[PDB]
Amino acid sequence: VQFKLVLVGDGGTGKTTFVKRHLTGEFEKKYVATLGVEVHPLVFHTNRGPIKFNVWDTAGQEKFGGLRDGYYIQAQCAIIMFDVTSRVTYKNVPNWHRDLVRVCENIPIVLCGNKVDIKDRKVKAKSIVFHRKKNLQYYDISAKSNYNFEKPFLWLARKLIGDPNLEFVAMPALAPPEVVMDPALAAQYEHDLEVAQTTALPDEDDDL
Amino acid sequence: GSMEGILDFSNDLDIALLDQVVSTFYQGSGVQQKQAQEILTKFQDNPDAWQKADQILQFSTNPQSKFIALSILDKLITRKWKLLPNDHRIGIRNFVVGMIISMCQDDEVFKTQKNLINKSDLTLVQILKQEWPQNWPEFIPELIGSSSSSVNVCENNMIVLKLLSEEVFDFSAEQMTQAKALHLKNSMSKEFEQIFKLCFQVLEQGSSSSLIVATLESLLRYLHWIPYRYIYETNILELLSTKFMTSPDTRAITLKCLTEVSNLKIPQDNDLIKRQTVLFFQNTLQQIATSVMPVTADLKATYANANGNDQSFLQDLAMFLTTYLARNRALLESDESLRELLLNAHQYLIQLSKIEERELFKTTLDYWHNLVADLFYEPLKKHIYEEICSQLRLVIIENMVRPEEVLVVENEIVREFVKESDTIQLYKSEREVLVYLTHLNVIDTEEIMISKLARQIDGSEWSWHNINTLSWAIGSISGTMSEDTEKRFVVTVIKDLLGLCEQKRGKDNKAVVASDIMYVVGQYPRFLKAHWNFLRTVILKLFEFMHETHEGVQDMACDTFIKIVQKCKYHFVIQQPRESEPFIQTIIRDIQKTTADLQPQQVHTFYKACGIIISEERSVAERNRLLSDLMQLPNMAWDTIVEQSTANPTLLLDSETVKIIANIIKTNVAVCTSMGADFYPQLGHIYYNMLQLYRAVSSMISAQVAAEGLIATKTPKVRGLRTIKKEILKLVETYISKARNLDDVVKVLVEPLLNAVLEDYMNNVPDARDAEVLNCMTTVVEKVGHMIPQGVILILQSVFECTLDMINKDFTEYPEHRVEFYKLLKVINEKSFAAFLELPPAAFKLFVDAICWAFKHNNRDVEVNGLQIALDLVKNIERMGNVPFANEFHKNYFFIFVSETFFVLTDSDHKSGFSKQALLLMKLISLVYDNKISVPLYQVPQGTSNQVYLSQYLANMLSNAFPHLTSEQIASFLSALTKQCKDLVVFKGTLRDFLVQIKEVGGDPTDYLFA
Amino acid sequence: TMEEDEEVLYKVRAKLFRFDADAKEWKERGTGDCKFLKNKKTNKVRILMRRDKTLKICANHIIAPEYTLKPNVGSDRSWVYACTADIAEGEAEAFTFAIRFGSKENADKFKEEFEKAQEINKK
Ligand SMILES: Nc1nc2c(ncn2[C@@H]2O[C@H](COP(=O)(O)OP(=O)(O)NP(=O)(O)O)[C@@H](O)[C@H]2O)c(=O)[nH]1
Ligand SMILES: *[C@@H]([C@H](C(N)=O)c1cncnc1)n1cnc(-c2cc(C(F)(F)F)cc(C(F)(F)F)c2)n1
Ligand SMILES: [Mg+2]
């Protein structure tokens, strides 16, 4: 039960950071431009079963665009991403959209305005209307704060599975094993643990 | 494995190997996929891959492989077409044409290869942009002709025309020069009569839906630009509004066509056109009622059910109705025979407005705001819409979104986590419409609200959702009623809401109802001001909630307190009748009791609200006494902590002491924020010891880095010591930015400040420098810089070079220093430019470097200040006129700024700054074309004008940077650009025309004569 | 769900990290409710933690008695400890974990409860 999801938008808007948060739970602060595309599978557990997305995280910087619209072939859904701290990225949303629906003419598409965590917002809420005429779903999101991070995938999953009441459910939790530590490498986990103890956790001013 | 073989072009291409790489990319996974991807990218990027295109299209069995071949041609056509020899051009044309014809005659390919035929049409369209009509003038005639040969070719011709209209009218601004865009637009316009014929015949004929839907999709595009006559002087509106509304195959595209038709503004004097605008609306609404849904249908349930394309049809319908009615409802409001039409349409909108779908609601709420604003001003309209407005009151009141202020929520009623900002704009838009609807009929709004309320008292309708949405609505209409009706309204509402918290017991009930009363009372300050006995009771009740164990209620009680005080402060400073003292006196006396269970942040808000009150007292002597009373606790704790720091300066080790100091300083910051200039006596009380404590904590931090390494700046202890330093800086900044007595700022504050902060900043290691030092200095320079020229010099010397070295190795480290640094250079450059003149020549050169380094950031905060500094700096040098410093400035730096500006304009990585980059460049060029540079810019024959040398420098500069341009392109560009250096808008157009030409070969040099 | 055969001894909101010893950085793994669950049938106590809105497991492992909570150099509200058999991602991998809480009180109460559990598992 798997669906091809293409992710598009200008460079720097936070596409790869958004996926990676869903893959691993981490927040990558560095900007390493995506080269062509990166494919990751991503599974959600719903009350209607598991749904699997094959996420084609494509590249926003033109000089890294690779096959460009060639990535869109046979996509079943998509996310268009812009950055609400960068007006230029909203203004290009119509260009990504044009190129996406020339290849994929009838697929569910979400428009996501990322980085609403940043105090100085530039793309005002009232100004975000492109999606109305094109029947896109729209959400404010932040990959850094997780604000609404799940809503694009919950929406798409409802549209793909055909069930507006589909919800995410807790995966069942198998008993964990009773493993005793290895005395051969017990003198070794002094070091691995020393490093981690003296590396400071990121973002110590956060509420958590 | 051996997938990389296709990258070797020595041999011929193994098509079957190509196809295996492709299917490994699309259909594979993991590493083989990731490796096939890199192979295909390298294959595509090869400047000769296009030659392999026709053999991939001839002999391949993979549609994806052919797609990728076409992407390779597209790249070649868009960027390098005119460098091809003419024979390859026609070969490529005839190949692409022939593959299209060939695919549209094979009924099986036509059905199953839609993606590949679309890609081919787009490729053909790329060839038209380059070749049509000047080297292909019969394209449109042949296309019309060939449309009779087949139904598959006619259908596909529509796709080509749709993609052509898009590329010419909808997406040409950014991708073509002005001149080329005009040329293709005029060419399409000239040949549209014929195109319309084909499209109108197809639509009347009526083959099958597949051709129809494509002809309509093309029509959607034409309507963005074609003349009104093609719509109103034919029978095409009757077709759209009737025939194609009935079939659901065509109904979606037709509605979108009718929305575009709507949106135009009609010639507002012709009775015929007006009647036609009415008729197509009347036809459309009859087909909806009869063939889709009657006006009573439950569109909320239909949309929730999400069968088929319902959700999209309802959205398109909402967009059609709102679009047409905002433009044209006046066509329906006077003729009595049009009244049911007007109202049925608005009745559909009432039903659309009950769907649960935020974004769809926002779309309809925008229309309702347009309506009710019109009805508040236009004479004789509102009675027409009375029953609509009555229904809208109920819709809005039952779907109020939670306001910012209401900090409780359900998951179990608990506290918020996050500032819902997708909700902030909605609430405001709901409030605005509801406030208008209350003006339009205040009696009906009250009756709705009081009855809904009567039916909560009864438990007849009780629930979290219902009492809340009602309460938020009741709050949101503050200021629409008369003071007298308000009086009786609020009384009733409060009486009823009090009854409700006594009935609904349990910890979750009482938190819901308490948040609702706080919201409501906080929203009616006019009432509170007039009913002092009630105001006093409200405040005492809020003080009570400050001891509540439910953290949501408690945090809300603090915010409600200061929200009330911002509006009613005057009533807390005067002595009220029947009161032994101003109420401020009672609040201050009891502050330790009132605030004892609050978190520190909430304590500081409480003190901030007391400062708002104290600043209402304008007798200086009485204000300063209130201020010292308010500050008694933090000042006794301060006087204690400072005798115990001076005697044996080591107690500050103590993590508890550190927290205590920071909260003292944060308390002063809170009170200073609301008292402003009036805070000065309190600041003077602590200033000298505070600056000594600053030096003392600075020593502690230094000594901990020294003993533990850089990692010490991550420890709780050192972050706490730095918090002390940051808060001291914030307090000083906060005071200085509101001070009215600048003479005291300079004579009392500034010198001890600079002695305390600047060397400590300069001689710390980089990871221990606080960027707040920079922010503090920026306010100092902003507010009194003009009075402290030697102080500004001193600031530069201490922070300029050492900060630059922190931030000039990449664009990412020390982000906050970066931003604060360019903010400080900006203010110094506009207010104390003399500081830069006394800079040594080496350091002035680092300053120019610093400005240019900012241009290259993508971080907009930095970039924009960089461009502004550069512009202001030019103005500053120009103002010196003809003197040595300015002439040596031009000799040394003029061409550095021209070329760096040109770099960021053309590298495609700094688009956000185009407008300011163009501004800077036009200023620079204009300096030379007004002989405001009184010195030769060169080291070339003597007597040469600076204008001639500038042209020469720039032609050489662009020739080496863009060697694929011809000399004539460059020369025409510079001629246009220099001629337009007093006309920013045209200058910008000319730069945009250049940015287009540098992306292709063979740009036409006459394009720069466009203006 | 596979949890109704268990009793909740302790719940707290936390943020969980996993140390990438190759990159030498901590990497967040999830943010949600951290629970101590005591198996009604075996009396074995585990940590189970789920992400807030996807509800995805981000920690599932026995609160072994061999484990020891250490402080992290940057925080007075966090604990580092090494885990040999965590199944949140599937195969029982080994991790160095850090878990941070809203406050230092939350962190200290967690350490108390974590240690009590170790005694219970000591049987
Ligand atoms: N403050 C904030 N920053 C974010 C957020 N999401 C992503 N970022 C930041 O945006 C920057 C770009 O990261 P990235 O996810 O790779 O963006 P991208 O669109 O995938 N880049 P590309 O298209 O070139 O491959 C990073 O620095 C990242 O920390 C967010 O939600 N909030
Ligand atoms: C009900 C009840 C009570 N008799 O005060 C109560 C409920 N919770 C906690 N403590 C007491 N109740 C609920 N809310 C109020 C209330 C709230 C305000 C305030 F929101 F603070 F403005 C004001 C008033 C008053 F001014 F007294 F009407 C009452 N009472
Ligand atoms: Mg990316």
Curated annotation (Swiss-Prot), chain A:
GO terms for cellular component: centriole; chromatin; cytoplasm; cytosol; extracellular exosome; male germ cell nucleus; manchette; melanosome. InterPro entries: P-loop_NTPase, Ran_GTPase, Small_GTP-bd, Small_GTPase. Expressed in a variety of tissues. The record marks 61 as: Essential for GTP hydrolysis. It comes from the Eukaryota. Gene3D superfamilies: P-loop containing nucleotide triphosphate hydrolases (3.40.50.300). It is an enzyme of class 3 (hydrolase). Acetylation by KAT5 at Lys-126 is increased during mitosis, impairs RANGRF binding and enhances RCC1 binding. Acetylation at Lys-29 enhances the association with nuclear export components. Deacetylation of Lys-29 by SIRT7 regulates the nuclear export of NF-kappa-B subunit RELA/p65. It is found in: Nucleus; Nucleus envelope; Cytoplasm, Cytosol; Cytoplasm. Its EC number is 3.6.5.-. The keyword Hydrolase applies. PROSITE patterns: RAN (PS51418). The modification Phosphothreonine is found at residue 16. Residues 1-163 form the Small GTPase Ran-type domain. There is a cross-link at residue 63 (Glycyl lysine isopeptide (Lys-Gly) (interchain with G-Cter in ubiquitin)). It catalyses: GTP + H2O = GDP + phosphate + H(+). The modification N6-acetyllysine is found at residues 29, 52, 63, 91, 126, 151. GTP binds at residues 10-17, 28-34, 60, 114-117, 142-144. Residues 29-37 are annotated as: Switch-I. Changing residue 11 to V: Blocks DNA replication. Changing residue 31 to A: Abolishes steric hindrance that traps the essential Q-61 in an unreactive position, and causes slow GTP hydrolysis in wild-type. Loss of one hydrogen bond with the gamma phosphate group of bound GTP. Its cofactor is Mg(2+). GTPase involved in nucleocytoplasmic transport, participating both to the import and the export from the nucleus of proteins and RNAs. Switches between a cytoplasmic GDP- and a nuclear GTP-bound state by nucleotide exchange and GTP hydrolysis. Nuclear import receptors such as importin beta bind their substrates only in the absence of GTP-bound RAN and release them upon direct interaction with GTP-bound RAN, while export receptors behave in the opposite way. Belongs to the small GTPase superfamily. Ran family. This is GTP-binding nuclear protein Ran. The lineage of its organism: Eukaryota, Metazoa, Chordata, Craniata, Vertebrata.
From Swiss-Prot, chain B:
One of its GO terms (cellular component) is kinetochore. SUPFAM superfamilies: ARM repeat (SSF48371). It holds the Pfam family CRM1_C. One of its GO terms (biological process) is tRNA re-export from nucleus. Disulfide bonds: none annotated. It comes from the Eukaryota. InterPro entries: ARM-like, ARM-type_fold, CRM1_repeat, Exp1_repeat_2, Exportin-1/Importin-b-like, Importin-beta_N, XPO1/5, XPO1_C_dom. GO terms for molecular function: nuclear export signal receptor activity; nuclear import signal receptor activity; small GTPase binding; U1 snRNA binding; U2 snRNA binding; U4 snRNA binding; U5 snRNA binding; U6 snRNA binding. Receptor for the leucine-rich nuclear export signal (NES). Present with 7080 molecules/cell in log phase SD medium. Belongs to the exportin family. This is Exportin-1. It comes from Saccharomyces cerevisiae (strain ATCC 204508 / S288c) (Baker's yeast). The gene is CRM1.
Swiss-Prot record, chain C:
One of its GO terms (molecular function) is small GTPase binding. It is found in: Cytoplasm; Nucleus. Interacts with GSP1 and PRP20. Belongs to the RANBP1 family. The gene is YRB1. Keywords: Cytoplasm, GTPase activation, Nucleus, Phosphoprotein, Protein transport, Transport. Important for the export of protein containing nuclear export signal (NES) out of the nucleus. Stimulates the GTPase activity of GSP1 and GSP2. GO terms for cellular component: cytoplasm; nuclear pore; nucleus. GO terms for biological process: G1/S transition of mitotic cell cycle; protein import into nucleus; RNA export from nucleus; ubiquitin-dependent protein catabolic process. This is Ran-specific GTPase-activating protein 1. Its main location: cytoplasm. Residues 1-123 form the RanBD1 domain.
